[PDB]
XYZ file of C-alpha atoms in Angstrom:
419
model
C -198.022 58.838 -11.938
C -199.592 61.910 -10.399
C -200.116 63.077 -13.942
C -202.120 59.948 -14.807
C -204.083 60.263 -11.656
C -205.072 63.873 -12.125
C -205.998 63.433 -15.829
C -208.729 60.948 -14.940
C -212.359 61.998 -14.099
C -211.285 62.930 -10.544
C -210.726 65.788 -8.149
C -207.985 65.475 -5.567
C -208.768 67.986 -2.719
C -208.601 68.636 1.058
C -211.820 69.833 2.651
C -211.758 72.074 5.700
C -215.187 72.641 7.127
C -215.162 75.559 9.481
C -218.077 77.458 11.134
C -217.429 80.660 9.217
C -216.005 79.321 5.991
C -215.866 76.271 3.872
C -212.298 76.103 2.626
C -210.796 73.888 -0.181
C -207.400 73.100 -1.459
C -207.028 71.070 -4.607
C -204.664 70.123 -7.400
C -205.546 71.978 -10.508
C -204.418 71.095 -13.987
C -200.926 72.178 -13.647
C -200.732 70.006 -10.559
C -200.349 72.971 -8.325
C -202.339 73.638 -5.131
C -205.274 75.880 -5.671
C -207.425 77.291 -2.849
C -210.551 79.284 -2.081
C -213.109 79.775 0.679
C -216.885 79.830 0.534
C -218.504 81.538 3.555
C -220.809 79.176 5.364
C -224.050 81.099 4.467
C -226.973 79.727 2.536
C -230.377 81.051 1.560
C -233.350 79.409 -0.171
C -233.503 80.236 -3.875
C -235.895 80.275 -6.930
C -235.846 77.007 -8.989
C -234.576 79.007 -12.000
C -232.420 82.178 -12.417
C -234.066 85.522 -11.620
C -233.748 88.756 -13.562
C -234.301 91.167 -10.773
C -230.765 91.400 -9.590
C -228.614 93.309 -7.059
C -226.185 94.913 -9.689
C -225.869 95.511 -13.305
C -224.756 92.447 -15.095
C -221.614 94.276 -16.493
C -220.251 95.435 -13.080
C -217.327 93.034 -12.842
C -215.707 94.586 -16.054
C -214.624 97.558 -13.819
C -213.448 94.986 -11.170
C -209.877 93.805 -10.281
C -210.467 90.629 -8.322
C -209.829 86.747 -8.252
C -212.250 83.882 -7.439
C -215.062 85.659 -9.389
C -216.668 82.301 -9.867
C -217.780 82.200 -6.277
C -219.278 85.621 -6.147
C -222.504 84.340 -7.581
C -223.483 80.831 -6.399
C -227.063 79.719 -7.237
C -227.141 76.050 -7.187
C -229.368 73.047 -7.228
C -227.867 70.133 -5.171
C -229.271 66.560 -5.383
C -227.697 64.448 -2.542
C -228.859 61.815 -0.083
C -226.646 63.661 2.447
C -229.425 66.465 2.329
C -232.955 65.868 3.670
C -235.847 65.769 1.139
C -236.629 69.472 1.452
C -233.239 70.982 1.013
C -232.601 68.372 -1.740
C -235.765 69.667 -3.531
C -234.883 73.373 -3.500
C -232.118 75.536 -5.159
C -229.840 77.580 -2.952
C -227.895 80.846 -2.858
C -224.478 80.051 -1.337
C -221.655 82.029 0.134
C -221.152 85.709 -0.715
C -224.373 85.892 -2.724
C -226.314 84.493 0.192
C -225.073 87.382 2.437
C -227.469 89.592 0.585
C -230.586 87.719 1.494
C -232.781 88.533 4.368
C -233.721 84.847 4.835
C -230.062 83.803 4.969
C -229.139 80.911 7.353
C -225.865 80.930 9.210
C -224.322 78.761 11.916
C -225.406 79.760 15.401
C -224.304 78.864 18.957
C -226.741 77.955 21.832
C -227.493 78.627 24.401
C -224.659 80.763 25.476
C -221.496 80.689 23.411
C -220.324 77.145 23.023
C -220.395 76.158 19.384
C -222.988 73.636 17.892
C -222.714 70.194 16.262
C -221.976 70.782 12.574
C -223.587 67.650 11.184
C -226.672 67.181 13.246
C -229.911 66.879 11.360
C -230.784 70.585 11.989
C -227.305 71.835 11.163
C -225.955 69.618 8.447
C -227.315 71.415 5.421
C -225.592 74.600 6.478
C -222.281 72.818 6.069
C -222.954 70.308 3.314
C -224.282 72.791 0.794
C -221.093 74.896 0.857
C -218.932 71.745 0.878
C -220.541 70.274 -2.129
C -220.524 73.683 -3.823
C -216.813 74.075 -3.220
C -216.315 70.597 -4.793
C -218.353 71.580 -7.803
C -216.554 74.864 -8.312
C -213.195 73.196 -8.359
C -214.360 70.529 -10.767
C -215.794 73.308 -12.955
C -212.356 75.058 -12.812
C -210.482 71.947 -13.992
C -212.974 71.362 -16.744
C -214.558 68.117 -15.519
C -218.253 67.345 -15.293
C -217.853 64.003 -13.602
C -215.473 63.559 -10.722
C -214.633 60.796 -8.296
C -213.774 62.732 -5.146
C -211.780 60.822 -2.438
C -212.774 62.638 0.743
C -209.949 63.812 2.988
C -211.316 66.002 5.816
C -210.869 66.324 9.552
C -212.840 67.213 12.742
C -211.809 68.517 16.088
C -211.495 66.172 19.014
C -214.808 67.034 20.661
C -216.763 65.478 17.898
C -215.181 62.072 18.535
C -217.344 61.830 21.733
C -220.339 62.333 19.366
C -219.670 60.833 16.002
C -216.783 58.507 14.756
C -214.755 59.201 11.605
C -216.574 56.482 9.636
C -219.948 58.181 10.347
C -218.814 61.400 8.824
C -217.545 59.434 5.816
C -220.835 57.362 5.616
C -222.874 60.490 5.510
C -220.743 61.527 2.400
C -220.539 58.322 0.414
C -222.533 58.193 -2.649
C -223.468 60.145 -5.629
C -224.199 64.069 -5.606
C -225.111 66.441 -8.422
C -224.496 70.120 -8.260
C -226.188 72.175 -11.012
C -225.234 75.803 -11.472
C -228.284 78.000 -12.219
C -226.412 81.272 -12.560
C -222.900 82.858 -12.565
C -219.787 81.707 -14.297
C -220.732 78.021 -14.709
C -224.427 78.556 -15.643
C -225.931 75.433 -17.191
C -223.205 73.145 -15.911
C -224.031 70.023 -13.903
C -221.313 68.421 -11.897
C -221.656 64.690 -10.987
C -219.697 63.902 -7.810
C -218.998 60.432 -6.681
C -217.443 59.803 -3.259
C -216.425 56.131 -2.812
C -213.809 56.372 -0.102
C -211.980 58.826 2.118
C -209.766 59.635 5.178
C -210.282 61.725 8.337
C -207.387 63.632 9.803
C -206.490 65.195 13.098
C -207.589 68.849 12.938
C -204.922 71.063 14.366
C -201.719 68.979 14.401
C -202.293 67.985 10.798
C -201.267 71.474 9.859
C -197.693 70.249 10.335
C -197.900 68.570 6.958
C -198.635 71.881 5.199
C -195.570 73.458 6.901
C -193.286 70.514 6.013
C -194.534 69.737 2.474
C -195.811 71.510 -0.713
C -197.112 70.062 -3.950
C -195.673 71.747 -7.083
C -196.542 70.590 -10.613
C -197.525 67.149 -9.288
C -194.549 66.672 -7.113
C -194.458 66.461 -3.246
C -191.512 68.659 -2.237
C -189.994 69.318 1.176
C -190.321 72.899 2.168
C -187.109 74.021 3.712
C -187.629 75.416 7.197
C -188.444 72.790 9.704
C -186.354 69.548 10.400
C -189.140 67.266 11.798
C -188.441 64.202 13.969
C -191.317 61.932 14.590
C -193.153 62.160 17.979
C -191.854 65.617 18.882
C -194.195 68.149 20.303
C -195.398 71.285 18.453
C -196.600 74.615 19.621
C -198.640 76.197 16.960
C -199.354 79.874 17.459
C -202.026 81.322 15.207
C -201.553 85.046 15.103
C -204.778 86.818 14.075
C -206.310 90.297 13.707
C -208.032 90.418 17.092
C -206.643 87.300 18.929
C -203.749 84.907 19.159
C -204.225 81.182 19.609
C -201.474 79.349 21.338
C -202.027 75.655 20.736
C -199.753 72.830 22.074
C -199.753 69.430 20.565
C -198.248 66.460 22.418
C -198.278 62.897 21.080
C -200.669 63.975 18.288
C -203.209 65.474 20.725
C -204.032 68.982 21.676
C -203.112 69.857 25.314
C -206.262 71.704 26.604
C -204.754 72.664 29.907
C -201.548 74.451 28.534
C -203.210 75.651 25.352
C -204.965 79.025 25.384
C -205.914 82.221 23.501
C -205.424 85.833 24.012
C -206.532 89.328 22.824
C -203.133 90.003 21.353
C -204.102 90.993 17.775
C -202.601 93.190 14.943
C -205.862 95.483 14.992
C -204.707 97.957 17.603
C -201.179 98.159 16.124
C -202.486 98.776 12.574
C -205.006 101.370 13.935
C -202.235 103.249 15.505
C -200.323 103.145 12.258
C -203.190 104.432 10.261
C -203.554 107.280 12.703
C -199.940 108.307 12.375
C -200.025 107.920 8.608
C -202.756 110.478 8.523
C -201.016 112.776 10.912
C -197.959 112.736 8.627
C -199.844 113.617 5.475
C -201.365 116.438 7.430
C -197.799 117.849 7.734
C -197.680 118.134 3.925
C -198.680 121.553 2.662
C -200.914 120.327 -0.141
C -202.955 118.395 2.495
C -203.002 121.539 4.739
C -204.442 123.572 1.851
C -207.166 121.185 0.951
C -208.027 118.985 3.862
C -207.451 120.778 7.077
C -210.073 119.702 9.777
C -211.419 116.744 7.705
C -212.213 113.176 8.795
C -211.126 111.285 5.675
C -207.816 109.177 5.419
C -205.900 107.271 2.764
C -207.062 103.806 3.700
C -210.653 102.311 3.938
C -210.095 99.429 6.362
C -207.265 97.559 8.111
C -207.579 94.989 5.227
C -207.186 97.694 2.637
C -203.919 98.745 4.385
C -202.684 95.212 4.651
C -203.452 94.350 1.005
C -202.359 97.480 -0.668
C -199.353 98.748 1.469
C -197.971 95.937 3.605
C -198.259 92.751 1.543
C -196.258 93.683 -1.442
C -193.263 94.718 0.682
C -193.459 91.714 2.973
C -193.429 89.415 -0.128
C -190.222 90.982 -1.232
C -188.861 90.671 2.446
C -189.749 86.933 2.414
C -188.017 86.410 -1.028
C -184.893 88.126 0.149
C -183.500 88.478 3.681
C -181.290 91.502 2.679
C -184.222 93.448 1.085
C -184.895 96.715 2.852
C -188.593 97.669 2.656
C -190.123 100.988 1.650
C -193.716 101.753 2.577
C -195.054 104.526 0.337
C -198.624 105.765 0.463
C -200.301 107.659 -2.298
C -203.333 109.771 -1.101
C -204.768 111.231 -4.298
C -201.817 112.795 -6.114
C -199.672 113.013 -3.059
C -197.090 110.373 -2.063
C -195.487 110.066 1.418
C -192.743 107.822 2.584
C -194.161 106.248 5.830
C -191.614 103.453 6.290
C -190.746 104.680 9.781
C -194.343 104.781 10.881
C -195.237 101.386 9.524
C -192.008 99.711 10.742
C -192.516 101.097 14.193
C -195.962 99.495 14.549
C -194.654 96.234 13.001
C -191.768 95.947 15.423
C -193.726 97.019 18.468
C -196.203 94.182 17.601
C -193.173 91.759 16.866
C -191.725 92.600 20.382
C -195.079 92.028 22.176
C -195.538 88.750 20.332
C -191.947 87.791 21.184
C -192.733 88.122 24.819
C -195.856 85.981 24.476
C -194.309 83.412 22.285
C -191.165 82.950 24.348
C -193.285 82.495 27.520
C -195.556 79.862 25.809
C -192.415 78.090 24.672
C -191.101 77.784 28.264
C -194.636 76.835 29.661
C -194.977 73.992 27.250
C -191.268 73.106 26.514
C -192.374 72.352 23.005
C -189.803 70.865 20.600
C -190.808 73.116 17.867
C -192.274 76.473 18.277
C -194.356 77.444 15.248
C -196.096 80.666 14.079
C -198.880 80.956 11.610
C -201.610 83.519 10.675
C -201.800 86.905 9.163
C -199.924 88.316 12.237
C -196.723 86.667 10.982
C -197.029 88.606 7.763
C -197.606 91.955 9.638
C -194.889 91.271 12.173
C -192.525 89.548 9.803
C -189.786 92.216 9.925
C -189.268 91.522 13.650
C -190.585 87.923 14.013
C -188.072 86.559 11.592
C -185.376 87.362 14.215
C -186.833 84.492 16.332
C -185.557 82.065 13.674
C -182.245 82.267 15.496
C -183.849 80.299 18.298
C -183.419 76.634 17.479
C -186.861 74.923 17.219
C -188.594 78.155 16.194
C -190.294 77.804 12.865
C -191.566 80.661 10.620
C -192.983 78.672 7.705
C -191.483 79.680 4.260
C -195.039 79.402 2.876
C -196.558 81.501 5.647
C -198.612 83.395 2.894
C -200.758 80.186 2.634
C -201.542 80.185 6.389
C -205.347 80.555 5.797
C -205.357 77.150 4.007
C -202.820 75.170 6.040
C -205.692 72.896 7.220
C -207.080 72.193 3.717
C -203.583 71.886 2.319
C -202.716 69.295 4.982
C -205.816 67.317 4.179
C -204.941 67.524 0.428
C -201.336 66.268 1.050
C -202.674 63.496 3.258
C -205.076 62.720 0.429
C -202.317 62.618 -2.254
C -200.214 60.261 -0.040
C -203.177 58.063 0.512
C -203.908 57.777 -3.266
C -200.183 57.081 -4.015
C -200.283 54.405 -1.337
C -203.072 52.649 -3.292
C -200.633 52.640 -6.430
């Protein structure tokens, strides 16, 4: 049934419109969930491709990365959701738009309380990356005409402004996206939106913890035993902040919910410092790098992606696996397992104190952790699983897309309900 559904001229996705990023999760041709993010950045572009370009054309052949098809987004979008002017022009979108002086990004006036995404002045900032994300997925699954049942969500504040059916009404109709450059150059995707659903941003994320879609099948992720109407604390552990959200009766509790400066950043910085300190105990490093500023990692993200993530994946697969963090700096390798594990567990313990306190303040039925911090702090945080009601999602690696995946699952269930 899902097979028959997906083989038609259609795209089944979940669309998460954030201020920084447009995220999408969709079912690809193997019926698996596929996700990417397009930064919410646009810039006015020439009507046809330009030859003066900010790199040699053959650069990506010395490059090791995924989602190459969104590195260069130069599109023409025809839609009645856009005003006449935007509709008339081509656009640079996402990463490629970052490198333009006349780029346009979301702002926040007139101190720091975020703006309305779909006002007449703001809407093109968010529609262009949304439609572009739809077009890229449609391109990926080899379909130039797609019916797109819209499944999105908005935070509760916009309910004082809009209405779900107003968002959907903006989106209904026909839209074309023509790629003028990059991977899909020459392709024109025709998007028809006839119907849709809007979901509760925030507590919807429960769906993505409870369910996955694998080869067309909805499967129950083992980890959380959900009873209907129970309260959820969702703690989003990030690089610079932690967000402690409490949901009761399907609504965010603003009074109890809060956010702090407890991030992974300072813990990682300390680890990076200690890692260098240890290499400088090595005699080869003494010979050639005494009194020098350089170090084996570029950024915190470099350290996360290259050193930490491969080991944590193995830990997540196998509770008995004992990790080894081995850094190579030029030709020299050092075992720094003690240094990394120290920072990981120090972070875990500080999060423990925070998470346990929030649990008692809310008396949440389920206490859930998500975010990159769970991955960094996994070696310690997984101990909290002994607390009944504490949930460390099996698919924590997909945290960035829990919102879009939730929409996607809701969208599949909706289409199946149609029969």
